[PDB]
Coordinates of N, CA, C and O in Angstrom, one line a residue:
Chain A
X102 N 14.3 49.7 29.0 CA 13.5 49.5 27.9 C 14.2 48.7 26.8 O 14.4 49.1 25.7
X103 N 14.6 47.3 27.2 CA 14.6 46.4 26.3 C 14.5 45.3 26.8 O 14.9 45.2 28.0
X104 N 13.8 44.1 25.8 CA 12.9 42.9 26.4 C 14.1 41.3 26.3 O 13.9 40.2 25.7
X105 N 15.3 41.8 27.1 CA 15.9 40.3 28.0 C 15.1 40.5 29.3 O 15.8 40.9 30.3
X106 N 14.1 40.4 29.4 CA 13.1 39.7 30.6 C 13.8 38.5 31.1 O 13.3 38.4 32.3
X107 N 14.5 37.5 31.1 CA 14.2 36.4 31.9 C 15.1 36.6 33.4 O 16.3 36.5 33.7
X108 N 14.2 36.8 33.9 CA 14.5 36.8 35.6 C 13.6 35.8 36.3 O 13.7 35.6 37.5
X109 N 12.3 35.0 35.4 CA 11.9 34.2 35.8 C 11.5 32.9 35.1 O 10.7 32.8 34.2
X110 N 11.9 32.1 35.5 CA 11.7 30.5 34.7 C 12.3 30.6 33.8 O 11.7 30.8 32.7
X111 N 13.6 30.3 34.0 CA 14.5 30.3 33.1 C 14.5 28.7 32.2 O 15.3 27.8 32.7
X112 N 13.8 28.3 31.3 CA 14.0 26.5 31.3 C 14.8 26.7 29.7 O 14.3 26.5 28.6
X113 N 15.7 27.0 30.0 CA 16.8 26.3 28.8 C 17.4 25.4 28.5 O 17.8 25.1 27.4
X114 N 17.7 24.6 30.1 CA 17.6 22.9 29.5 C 17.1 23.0 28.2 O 16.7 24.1 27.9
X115 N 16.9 21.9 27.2 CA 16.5 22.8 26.2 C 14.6 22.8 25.4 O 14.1 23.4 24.4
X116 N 14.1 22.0 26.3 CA 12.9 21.9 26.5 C 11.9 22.2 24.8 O 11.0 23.0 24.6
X117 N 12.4 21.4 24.1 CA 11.4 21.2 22.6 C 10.3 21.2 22.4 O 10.0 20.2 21.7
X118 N 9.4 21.9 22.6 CA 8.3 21.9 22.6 C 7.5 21.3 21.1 O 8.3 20.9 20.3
X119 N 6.5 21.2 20.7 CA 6.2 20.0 19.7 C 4.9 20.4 19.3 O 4.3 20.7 20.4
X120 N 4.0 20.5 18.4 CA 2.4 20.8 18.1 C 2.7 19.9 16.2 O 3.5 19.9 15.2
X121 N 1.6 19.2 16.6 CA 1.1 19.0 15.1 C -0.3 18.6 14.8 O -0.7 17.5 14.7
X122 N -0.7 19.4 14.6 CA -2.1 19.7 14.2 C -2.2 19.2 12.6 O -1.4 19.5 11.7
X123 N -3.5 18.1 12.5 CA -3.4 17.3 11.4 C -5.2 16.8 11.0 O -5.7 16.0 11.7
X124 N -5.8 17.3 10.2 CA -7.1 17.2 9.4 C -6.9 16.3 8.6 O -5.9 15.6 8.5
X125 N -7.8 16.2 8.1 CA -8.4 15.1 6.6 C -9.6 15.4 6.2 O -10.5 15.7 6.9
X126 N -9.8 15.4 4.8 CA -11.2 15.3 4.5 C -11.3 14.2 3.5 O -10.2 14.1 3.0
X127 N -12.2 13.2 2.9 CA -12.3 12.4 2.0 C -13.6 12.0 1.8 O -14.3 11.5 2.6
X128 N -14.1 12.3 0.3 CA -15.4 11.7 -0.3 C -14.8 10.5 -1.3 O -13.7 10.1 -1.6
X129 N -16.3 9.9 -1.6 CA -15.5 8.6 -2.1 C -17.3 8.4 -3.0 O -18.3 8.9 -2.5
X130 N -17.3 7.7 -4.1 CA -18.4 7.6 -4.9 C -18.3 6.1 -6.3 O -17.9 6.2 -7.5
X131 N -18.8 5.0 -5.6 CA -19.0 4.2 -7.0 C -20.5 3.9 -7.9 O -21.5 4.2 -7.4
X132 N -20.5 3.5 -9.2 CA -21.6 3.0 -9.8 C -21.3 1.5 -10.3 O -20.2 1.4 -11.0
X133 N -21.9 0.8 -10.2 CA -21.3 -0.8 -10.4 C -22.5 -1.4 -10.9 O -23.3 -2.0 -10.2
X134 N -22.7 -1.2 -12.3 CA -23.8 -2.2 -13.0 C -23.2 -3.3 -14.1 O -22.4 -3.4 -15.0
X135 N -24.2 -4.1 -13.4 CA -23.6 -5.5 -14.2 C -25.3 -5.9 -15.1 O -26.4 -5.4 -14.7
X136 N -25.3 -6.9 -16.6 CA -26.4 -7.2 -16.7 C -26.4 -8.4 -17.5 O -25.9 -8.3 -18.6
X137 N -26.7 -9.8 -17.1 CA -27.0 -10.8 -17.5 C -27.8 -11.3 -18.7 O -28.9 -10.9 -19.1
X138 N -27.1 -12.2 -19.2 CA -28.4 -12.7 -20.6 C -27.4 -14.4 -20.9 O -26.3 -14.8 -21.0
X139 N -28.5 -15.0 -20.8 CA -28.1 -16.7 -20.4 C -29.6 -17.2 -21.0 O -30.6 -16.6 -20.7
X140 N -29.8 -18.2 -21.7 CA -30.8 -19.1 -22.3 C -30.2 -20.6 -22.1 O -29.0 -20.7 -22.0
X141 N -31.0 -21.5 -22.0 CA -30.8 -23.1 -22.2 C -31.3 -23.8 -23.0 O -32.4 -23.4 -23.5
X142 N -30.8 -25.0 -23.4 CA -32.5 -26.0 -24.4 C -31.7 -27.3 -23.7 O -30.7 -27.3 -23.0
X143 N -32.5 -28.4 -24.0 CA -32.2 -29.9 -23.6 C -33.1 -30.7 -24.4 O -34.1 -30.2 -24.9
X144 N -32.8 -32.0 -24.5 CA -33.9 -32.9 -25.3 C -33.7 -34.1 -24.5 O -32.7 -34.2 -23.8
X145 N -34.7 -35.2 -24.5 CA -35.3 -35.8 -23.7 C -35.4 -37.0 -24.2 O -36.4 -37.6 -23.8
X146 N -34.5 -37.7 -25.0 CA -35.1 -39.1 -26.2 C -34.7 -40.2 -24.8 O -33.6 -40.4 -24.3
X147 N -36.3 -40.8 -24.3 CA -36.4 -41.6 -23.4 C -36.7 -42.6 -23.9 O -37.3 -42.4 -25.0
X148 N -36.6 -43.8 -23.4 CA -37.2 -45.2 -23.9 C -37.6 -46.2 -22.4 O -37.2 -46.1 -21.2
X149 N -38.4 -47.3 -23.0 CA -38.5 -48.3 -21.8 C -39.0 -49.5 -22.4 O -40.0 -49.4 -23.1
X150 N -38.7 -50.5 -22.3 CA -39.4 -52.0 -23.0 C -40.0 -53.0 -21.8 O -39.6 -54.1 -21.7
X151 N -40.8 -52.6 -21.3 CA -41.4 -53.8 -20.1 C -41.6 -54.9 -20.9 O -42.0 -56.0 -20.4
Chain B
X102 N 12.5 55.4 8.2 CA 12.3 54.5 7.0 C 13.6 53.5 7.1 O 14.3 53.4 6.1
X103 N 13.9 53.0 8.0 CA 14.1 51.1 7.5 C 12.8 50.1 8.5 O 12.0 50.6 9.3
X104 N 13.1 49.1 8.3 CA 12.1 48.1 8.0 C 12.1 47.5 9.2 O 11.0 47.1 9.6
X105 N 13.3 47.3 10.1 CA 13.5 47.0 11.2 C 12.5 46.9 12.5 O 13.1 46.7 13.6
X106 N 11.3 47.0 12.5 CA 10.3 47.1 13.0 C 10.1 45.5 14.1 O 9.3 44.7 13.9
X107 N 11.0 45.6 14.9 CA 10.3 44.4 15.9 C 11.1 45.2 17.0 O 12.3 45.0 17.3
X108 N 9.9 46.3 17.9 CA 9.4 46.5 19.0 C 9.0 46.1 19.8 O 9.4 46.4 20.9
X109 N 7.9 44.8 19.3 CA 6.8 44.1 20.0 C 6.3 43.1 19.2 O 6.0 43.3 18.0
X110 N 6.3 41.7 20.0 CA 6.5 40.8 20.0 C 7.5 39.8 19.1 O 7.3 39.4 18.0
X111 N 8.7 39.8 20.0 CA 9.8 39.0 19.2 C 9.5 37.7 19.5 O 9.4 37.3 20.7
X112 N 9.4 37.0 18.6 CA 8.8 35.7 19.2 C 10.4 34.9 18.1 O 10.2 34.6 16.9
X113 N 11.8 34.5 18.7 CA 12.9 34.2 18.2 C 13.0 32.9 19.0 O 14.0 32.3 18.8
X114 N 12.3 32.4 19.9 CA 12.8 31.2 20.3 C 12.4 30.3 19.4 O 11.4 29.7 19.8
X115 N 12.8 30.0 18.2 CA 12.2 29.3 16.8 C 11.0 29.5 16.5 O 10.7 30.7 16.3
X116 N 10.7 29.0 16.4 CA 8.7 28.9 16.4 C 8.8 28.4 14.9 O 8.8 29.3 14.0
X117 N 8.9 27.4 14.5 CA 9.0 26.7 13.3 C 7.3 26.9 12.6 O 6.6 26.0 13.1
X118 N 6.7 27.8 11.8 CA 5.5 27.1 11.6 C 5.4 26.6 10.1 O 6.0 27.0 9.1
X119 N 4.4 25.5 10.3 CA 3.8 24.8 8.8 C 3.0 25.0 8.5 O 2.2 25.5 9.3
X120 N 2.7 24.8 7.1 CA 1.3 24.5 6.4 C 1.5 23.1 5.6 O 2.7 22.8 5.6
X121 N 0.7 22.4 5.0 CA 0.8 21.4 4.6 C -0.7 21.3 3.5 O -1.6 20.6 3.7
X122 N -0.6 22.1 2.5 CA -2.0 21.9 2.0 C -2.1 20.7 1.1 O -1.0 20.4 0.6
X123 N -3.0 20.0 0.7 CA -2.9 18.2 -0.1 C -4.4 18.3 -0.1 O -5.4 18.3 0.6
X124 N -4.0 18.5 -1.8 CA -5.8 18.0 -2.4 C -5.4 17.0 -3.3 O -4.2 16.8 -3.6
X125 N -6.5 16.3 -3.9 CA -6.2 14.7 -4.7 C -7.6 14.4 -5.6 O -8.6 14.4 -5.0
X126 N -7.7 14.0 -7.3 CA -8.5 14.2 -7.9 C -8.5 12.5 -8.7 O -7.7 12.3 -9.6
X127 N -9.3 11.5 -8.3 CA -9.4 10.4 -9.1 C -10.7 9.7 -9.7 O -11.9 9.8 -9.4
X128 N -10.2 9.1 -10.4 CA -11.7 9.1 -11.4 C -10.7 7.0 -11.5 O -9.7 6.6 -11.0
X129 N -11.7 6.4 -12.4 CA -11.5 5.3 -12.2 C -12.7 4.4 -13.3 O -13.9 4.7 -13.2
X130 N -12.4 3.8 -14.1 CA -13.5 2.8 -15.1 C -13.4 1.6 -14.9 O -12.5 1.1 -14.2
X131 N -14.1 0.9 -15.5 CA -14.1 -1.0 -15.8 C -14.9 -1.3 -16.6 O -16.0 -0.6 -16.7
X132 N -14.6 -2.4 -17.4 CA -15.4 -3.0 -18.6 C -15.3 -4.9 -18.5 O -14.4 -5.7 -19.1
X133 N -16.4 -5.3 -17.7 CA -16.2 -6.8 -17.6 C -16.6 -7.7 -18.4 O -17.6 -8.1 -17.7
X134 N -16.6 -8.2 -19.2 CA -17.4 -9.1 -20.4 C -17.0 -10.4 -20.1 O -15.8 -10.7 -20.4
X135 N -17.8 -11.3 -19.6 CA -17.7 -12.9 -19.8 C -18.8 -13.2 -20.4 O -19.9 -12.7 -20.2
X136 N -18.5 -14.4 -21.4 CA -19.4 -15.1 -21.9 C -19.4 -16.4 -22.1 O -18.7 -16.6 -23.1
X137 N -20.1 -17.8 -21.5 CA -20.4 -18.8 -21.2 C -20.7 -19.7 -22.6 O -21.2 -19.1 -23.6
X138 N -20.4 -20.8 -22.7 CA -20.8 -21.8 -23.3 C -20.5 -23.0 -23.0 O -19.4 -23.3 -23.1
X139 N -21.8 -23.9 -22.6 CA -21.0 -25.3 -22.1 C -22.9 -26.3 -22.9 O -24.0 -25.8 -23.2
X140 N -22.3 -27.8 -22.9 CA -23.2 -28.5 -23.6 C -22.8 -29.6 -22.9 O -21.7 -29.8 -22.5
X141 N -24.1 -30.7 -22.8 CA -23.6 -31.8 -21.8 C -24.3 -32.7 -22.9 O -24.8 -32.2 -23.9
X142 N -24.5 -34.3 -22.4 CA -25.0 -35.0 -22.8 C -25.1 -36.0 -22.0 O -24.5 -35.7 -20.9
X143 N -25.8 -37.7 -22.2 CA -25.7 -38.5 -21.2 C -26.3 -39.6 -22.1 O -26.7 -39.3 -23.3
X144 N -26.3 -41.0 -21.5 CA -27.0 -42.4 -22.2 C -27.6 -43.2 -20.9 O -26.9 -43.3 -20.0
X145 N -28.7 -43.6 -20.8 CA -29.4 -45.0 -19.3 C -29.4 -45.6 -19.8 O -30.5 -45.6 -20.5
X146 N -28.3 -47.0 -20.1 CA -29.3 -48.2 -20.4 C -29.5 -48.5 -18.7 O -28.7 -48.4 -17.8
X147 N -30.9 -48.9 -18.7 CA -31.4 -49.5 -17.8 C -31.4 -50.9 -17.6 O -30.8 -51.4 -18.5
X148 N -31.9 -51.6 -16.7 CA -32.8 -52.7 -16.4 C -33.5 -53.4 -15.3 O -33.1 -53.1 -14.2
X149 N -34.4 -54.1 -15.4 CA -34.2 -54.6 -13.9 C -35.5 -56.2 -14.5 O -36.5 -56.0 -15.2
X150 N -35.0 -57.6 -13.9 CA -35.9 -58.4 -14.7 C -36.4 -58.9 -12.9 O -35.8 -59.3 -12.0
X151 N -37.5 -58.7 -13.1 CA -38.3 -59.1 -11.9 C -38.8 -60.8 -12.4 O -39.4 -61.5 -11.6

């Protein structure tokens, strides 16, 4: 009654065993207001002499 | 009464474990202001003598 068990499969070569367990979570949220204000004028002083 | 209590399951072949907890809080503004001003002009002298 004590637990040196190995009499079977002994792999101590040294055999590294490896786990990485890797999640994520990500929310993400924009508001993008834009608002325009633009006016024009022109004038027109035409002529013609046939 | 001491503390010594590993009977069952010695688990001494390393067993390296992690946690890795990562939370992240961002907030974010903008303020765009363009404003335009442009003025043209022009002159035709014309002609044409048929």
């Amino acid at each position: 009654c004590i637990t040196h068990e190995d009499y079977l499969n002994v792999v101590y070569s040294s055999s590294e065993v490896e786990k990485y367990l890797q999640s994520q979570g990500f929310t993400e949220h924009n508001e993008d207001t834009t608002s325009n204000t633009d006016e024009t004028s022109n004038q027109n002083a035409t002529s013609l002499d046939n």
